[PDB]
Amino acid sequence: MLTDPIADMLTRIRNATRVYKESTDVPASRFKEEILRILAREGFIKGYERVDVDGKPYLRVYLKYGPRRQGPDPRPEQVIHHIRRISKPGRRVYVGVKEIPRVRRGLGIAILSTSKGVLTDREARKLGVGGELICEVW
């Protein structure tokens, strides 16, 4: 059974972009969808869309990359260079608004889950609230 669906999602995305997939599916769940809204809005992913693979509900995640590069190895740059889980079952991580991390000096992001909904480190700071430090992306 899946132990960390969020980590599973973070990974499907990580795994798919390394082989440069078009899209990539992940079993749908509200919370996951919330993470995606952010990834989308932040521009790490072309976007996402609900779908029904084999009757059950999934989430086509449309990955996005850079342009072809020169020299040997034309493989484009990743838009999602890093995407790692922070909080996890058996070691949840929480933070006060005063203790929210600044991922790659703002060039990156951190997705927290607060009592005011899922928000990036900036959004969170704005509504001055902390929560579970879901993961970071950059």
């Binding site: 521009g43 850079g66 838009v79 790659r104 000096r105 703002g106 060039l107 990156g108």
Partner: protein, 150 residues
Amino acid sequence: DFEEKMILIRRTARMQAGGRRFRFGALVVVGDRQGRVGLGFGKAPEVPLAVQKAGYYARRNMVEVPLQNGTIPHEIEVEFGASKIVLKPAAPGTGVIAGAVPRAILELAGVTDILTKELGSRNPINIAYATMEALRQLRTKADVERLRKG
């Protein structure tokens, strides 16, 4: 124009009937102190030829460092082999806090304030490459913008 700093020169040895037959390896950094460095590792029968070959290889291997007022735009950790290197941005007046290897590279890239740390295997050659690669992976808001803009 370009400045060169010799990172290290070693005298390797090989076996043959009769005895050992030597060679020399040399690590050289080349920078304009304007955000451009290059690493070259040249090996030859003689130390000079080695150094020269190294310098020559270095200029052929350059990196455009996104200097933002003597410092790096953001922190990064790069592992090259068993060597890991930690680069952290620093305010002016801080200086270049680094081992001799990363320093030489950083200084010629025109970095003036940076926090640094050598982890894992501290093999000069490998720490050097981890560094160049760290620098090479540095990105700018401008860059992230073009990237996530799409």
